[PDB]
Design a protein around this ligand. Structure first.
Ligand SMILES: [Mg+2]
Ligand SMILES: [Mg+2]
Ligand SMILES: [Mg+2]
Ligand SMILES: [Mg+2]
Ligand SMILES: [Mg+2]
Ligand SMILES: [Mg+2]
Ligand SMILES: [Mg+2]
Ligand SMILES: [Mg+2]
Ligand SMILES: [Mg+2]
Ligand SMILES: [Mg+2]
Ligand SMILES: [Mg+2]
Ligand SMILES: [Mg+2]
Ligand SMILES: [Mg+2]
Ligand SMILES: [Mg+2]
Ligand SMILES: [Mg+2]
Ligand SMILES: [Mg+2]
Ligand SMILES: [Mg+2]
Ligand SMILES: [Mg+2]
Ligand SMILES: [Mg+2]
Ligand SMILES: [Mg+2]
Ligand SMILES: [Mg+2]
Ligand SMILES: [Mg+2]
Ligand SMILES: [Mg+2]
Ligand SMILES: [Mg+2]
Ligand SMILES: [Mg+2]
Ligand SMILES: [Mg+2]
Ligand SMILES: [Mg+2]
Ligand SMILES: [Mg+2]
Ligand SMILES: [Mg+2]
Ligand SMILES: [Mg+2]
Ligand SMILES: [Mg+2]
Ligand SMILES: [Mg+2]
Ligand SMILES: [Mg+2]
Ligand SMILES: [Mg+2]
Ligand SMILES: [Mg+2]
Ligand SMILES: [Mg+2]
Ligand SMILES: [Mg+2]
Ligand SMILES: [Mg+2]
Ligand SMILES: [Mg+2]
Ligand SMILES: [Mg+2]
Ligand SMILES: [Mg+2]
Ligand SMILES: [Mg+2]
Ligand SMILES: [Mg+2]
Ligand SMILES: [Mg+2]
Ligand SMILES: [Mg+2]
Ligand SMILES: [Mg+2]
Ligand SMILES: [Mg+2]
Ligand SMILES: [Mg+2]
Ligand SMILES: [Mg+2]
Ligand SMILES: [Mg+2]
Ligand SMILES: [Mg+2]
Ligand SMILES: [Mg+2]
Ligand SMILES: [Mg+2]
Ligand SMILES: [Mg+2]
Ligand SMILES: [Mg+2]
Ligand SMILES: [Mg+2]
Ligand SMILES: [Mg+2]
Ligand SMILES: [Mg+2]
Lengths: 271, 93, 46
RNA sequence: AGGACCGAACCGACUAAUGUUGAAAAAUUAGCGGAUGACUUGUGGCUGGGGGUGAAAGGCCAAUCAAACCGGGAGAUAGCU
RNA sequence: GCUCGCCGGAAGACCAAGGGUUCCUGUCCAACGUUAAUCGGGGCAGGGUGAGUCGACCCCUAAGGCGAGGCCGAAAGGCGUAGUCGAUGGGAAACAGGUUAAUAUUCCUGUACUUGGUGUUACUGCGAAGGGGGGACGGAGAAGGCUAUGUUGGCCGGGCGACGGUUGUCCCGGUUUAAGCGUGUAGGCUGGUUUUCCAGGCAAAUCCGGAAAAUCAAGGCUGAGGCGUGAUGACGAGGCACUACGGUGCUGAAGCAACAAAUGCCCUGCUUCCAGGAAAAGCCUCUAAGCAUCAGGUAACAUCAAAUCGUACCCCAAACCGACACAGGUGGUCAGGUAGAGAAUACCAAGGCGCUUGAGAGAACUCGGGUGAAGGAACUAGGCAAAAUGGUGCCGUAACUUCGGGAGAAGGCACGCUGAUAUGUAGGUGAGGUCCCUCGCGGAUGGAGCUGAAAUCAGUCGAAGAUACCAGCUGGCUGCAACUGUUUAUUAAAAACACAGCACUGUGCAAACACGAAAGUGGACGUAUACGGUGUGACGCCUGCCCGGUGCCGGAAGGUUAAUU
């Protein structure tokens, strides 16, 4: 459902929108809602620590079940919903014992579908199982890193993880980045891909669209004075230097990962 | 039961003026100078017991003292409390 | 035009008031200095 | 429907004249731009000086800014007047 | 006092902030007021601010602040849990009339309403730091139903006109009424009820959520306005009598309808879109520990209480911010008439002002404007400035184009008044009357009365009918930037910055990175369709060769190489 706006105005000419008629047009499930006020990139010292954040639409936080630890009880998908906090869509599910929860909506999951989590659940999209119980070569999403901690990998719209091999108490996984990573075989994964894969086909069309999402403008370092960026200065457009961050670190190709604690779980880097 | 001493403290002076006199003739109200911390109940009880009169309601306001000048020197008069207390058409204090 | 001083009692009290001075040792040093000088008015509170 | 169009409030500040010991330490008059938006505005809050903030002009941070203001080192030093 | 002029979406009225006696009265004119001053926001003295219902206080929380223990840090301190504060937001209740020199929803008169404590009666399962419900929420858009309000008619009171006419199809004025209570209407939402069960709501729940039955077919909640009452009252033009000439007192007619109509109400509604739209308490409901012929709750009545603080006055300003009685700045509400699309604009109403030096004269020159023979950009760096265009309806409109635009392209025609169409039309509103029923704020019909565009034909006046105020100059070639935005507060608004888009690069989550000696925090309650950095800058067609130098990435055979030994 990718549709382009007619050029009735200069700010509409290039707009491409993704609209899902399958989504709920009403209000979200109130008992699973929380407030999340905005930070503007400021930390508890009040200083800007991440640039280019501010403004944007008010959002309510939807408590989403990333653990899926309620094993044994089946559930039905009531509807699909828009989530402002993330790219992917979320689904409201009703457990047969009378409990309602939000889950990430995987690709192909519509109203009426049944889901189940546990060691003894069927291998079908939406169901969560320990990767010890999932056939090798399965497309999964919402992958746990530590058992019982909740899904942390492949959560954005359209993403998944490939279960490449299983030897010992460990499974080899291929991540969206191309990295090959070993994780413990007791970590749960949900079958299938994350839905809303057309999310990347959108074209914002105008500056105001980026402002609505809370992104503030980026000023090129080469356009400022030398006192406040390494790239600054010159009479006319001049560069004559190797590109760096505002803090002087070379910013085209220099590697920054330094974590010896988790080096043992990486099979190959994304390259 | 507000004590005898407090009742004897809370009344200071009648308020003499044209508006007070008119309140007396028209609405059967006496206007009093009372203590700054004196409450409506204390004023009512003191008026009833020392004036030997029956009271139905007490209205209170605080007067802000005036800033005047005594020979190039700044000087301010004190705040005070004034009470509009109504008598019930039978006592005529 | 819009000048620099836009009065507000609440903001003045919170920024320069007695409680605000007493809340940090530097503010208490301000009070100590102003008492040692002999100021008739220590703060903006009054 | 629209960072859509004309146009008041409102926000601004392109031209000209006046004023330049001003009515005003930045305005007035006639025109001028935006005017449902990246809009505007009230109240309160947070970020502190080699620091902040900056759709970036070295702009702004109380008529002060290529390093605020106040006090102190302090009677800095001055082959200069 | 009588004339004149000005504002009237304010130059009127009222809140908030800010100020603090500037408010009212008597007295005085030294100093202050850009002059005089008998006057004043000046001096001096007195007076003036009345609340259960307005606000604060109070209960509840947002951002944020503080923070027992705690974690961290040479010290000073930093951060933060349980908590506790913090409105700009949520939470009970009052209206109309009258009165002062100065207060009034506070005082008086009349009519109301809220909350709680005590006593009793009757009935009875009550009980929270806990569960559930609710409070509770966006932008835009569209009707429909109303009201504030206005106009006209009717009614009542008065008038008969300084100069031709004016007993009428004439002139002037008035024609007002609340909260509350009763009614539950236009409309909005939702299918109800009694059963039986259950991996859920941290345990319990009879409450909420889920599963199934049978029955019923209309129940429930919400809601402007209207009407009745409130009100045989109050108010009321005017009239009679004084007046200390400021004003005081008594009396008191009509007090109806039709039509028009909001940006206000129903509406926290409905339709729709994506950027997906606070919290907590009050409130309702459910049980646990536990009390249980007591407590405790429900309903009816009686009684008591609702403290304290603010309340004057200015508030687009001479009282606030600007050193000034300073052409500046200052958030919200109110919103009449004619014309008009209009909160533009012109003249007016209510109301408020003539801006704290005047009097003459009628030179140059300066400032702000009007008009101009013939010419018409010859001016000048440059058409700077000025002049000009300017409305509605209809007709018509090119290259180019991303097919939306270009476009109001260009250019043209009509425009006042009167009569007829039509004693006022198309349309709108709509009383009676009749008919019907689950009876009412009900439906069908009926159309009196009221209101009422635009068009046509014919005449008619002027030089001129969008006559004033108001209100696009237009076209042709070209550089730059795609565009809307932003910027050097106070000589630069631009071709500069940003931008949607593109690319390189880093980053596997205790992410990279940033702020922090640290604890922590942001990134992000995000997870590579993500986040940071860098350069370029919509879109179209595209983006060639060089890795010698410098940087970055990968490799470790050999050489050199620190502390150490
Ligand atoms: Mg960024
Ligand atoms: Mg960018
Ligand atoms: Mg520059
Ligand atoms: Mg540098
Ligand atoms: Mg150059
Ligand atoms: Mg070069
Ligand atoms: Mg009273
Ligand atoms: Mg009071
Ligand atoms: Mg626009
Ligand atoms: Mg425009
Ligand atoms: Mg500006
Ligand atoms: Mg102007
Ligand atoms: Mg405009
Ligand atoms: Mg400055
Ligand atoms: Mg320096
Ligand atoms: Mg020294
Ligand atoms: Mg010296
Ligand atoms: Mg020398
Ligand atoms: Mg006028
Ligand atoms: Mg005075
Ligand atoms: Mg006065
Ligand atoms: Mg004088
Ligand atoms: Mg005076
Ligand atoms: Mg401690
Ligand atoms: Mg703290
Ligand atoms: Mg807190
Ligand atoms: Mg509190
Ligand atoms: Mg408040
Ligand atoms: Mg008054
Ligand atoms: Mg009406
Ligand atoms: Mg409007
Ligand atoms: Mg008042
Ligand atoms: Mg000044
Ligand atoms: Mg003056
Ligand atoms: Mg002024
Ligand atoms: Mg303003
Ligand atoms: Mg006007
Ligand atoms: Mg002259
Ligand atoms: Mg002239
Ligand atoms: Mg002229
Ligand atoms: Mg002439
Ligand atoms: Mg001529
Ligand atoms: Mg001529
Ligand atoms: Mg000519
Ligand atoms: Mg020429
Ligand atoms: Mg020439
Ligand atoms: Mg020449
Ligand atoms: Mg010009
Ligand atoms: Mg002109
Ligand atoms: Mg005609
Ligand atoms: Mg050229
Ligand atoms: Mg541009
Ligand atoms: Mg522009
Ligand atoms: Mg400038
Ligand atoms: Mg400029
Ligand atoms: Mg972290
Ligand atoms: Mg560029
Ligand atoms: Mg370019």
């Amino acid at each position: 459902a990718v549709v382009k706006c007619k050029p009735t105005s200069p700010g509409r000419r290039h707009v491409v929108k993704v609209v899902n008629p399958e989504l709920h047009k009403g209000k979200p499930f109130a008992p699973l809602l929380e407030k999340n006020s905005k930070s503007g990139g400021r930390n508890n010292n009040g200083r800007i620590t991440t640039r280019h954040i501010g403004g944007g639409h008010k959002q309510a936080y939807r408590i989403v079940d990333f653990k899926r630890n309620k094993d044994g009880i089946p559930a039905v998908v009531e509807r699909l919903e828009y989530d402002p906090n993330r790219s992917a869509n979320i689904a409201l599910v009703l457990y047969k014992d009378g409990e309602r929860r939000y889950i990430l909506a995987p690709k192909g999951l519509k109203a009426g579908d049944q889901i189940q989590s546990g060691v003894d659940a069927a291998i079908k999209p939406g169901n969560t199982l320990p990767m010890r119980n999932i056939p090798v070569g399965s497309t999964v999403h919402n992958v746990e890193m530590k058992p019982g901690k909740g899904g942390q990998l492949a959560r954005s719209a359209g993403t998944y993880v490939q279960i490449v091999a299983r030897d010992g108490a460990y499974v080899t996984l291929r991540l969206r980045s191309g990295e090959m990573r070993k994780v413990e075989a007791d970590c749960r994964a949900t079958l299938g891909e994350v839905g809303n894969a057309e999310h990347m086909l959108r074209v914002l069309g105008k500056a105001g669209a980026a402002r609505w999402r809370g992104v503030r403008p980026t000023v090129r370092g080469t356009a400022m004075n030398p006192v406040d960026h390494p790239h600054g200065g010159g009479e006319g457009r001049n560069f004559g230097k190797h590109p760096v961050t505002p803090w002087g670190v070379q910013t085209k190709g220099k590697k920054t990962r330094s974590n010896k604690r988790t080096d043992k779980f990486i099979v190959r880097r994304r390259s | 039961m507000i004590r005898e001493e407090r009742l004897l403290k809370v009344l200071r002076a009648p308020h003499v003026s044209e508006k007070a006199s008119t309140a007396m003739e028209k609405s059967n109200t006496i206007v009093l100078k009372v203590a700054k911390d004196a409450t409506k109940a204390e004023i009512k009880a003191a008026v009833q017991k020392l004036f030997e009169v029956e009271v139905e309601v007490v209205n209170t306001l605080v007067v802000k003292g005036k800033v005047k000048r005594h020979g190039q020197r700044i000087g301010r008069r004190s705040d005070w409390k004034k009470a509009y207390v109504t008598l019930k058409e039978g006592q005529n204090l | 035009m819009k000048r620099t001083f836009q009065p507000s009692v609440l903001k003045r009290n919170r920024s320069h008031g007695f409680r605000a001075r007493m809340a940090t040792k530097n503010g208490r040093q301000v009070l100590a200095r102003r008492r040692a000088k002999g100021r008739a008015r220590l703060t903006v509170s009054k």
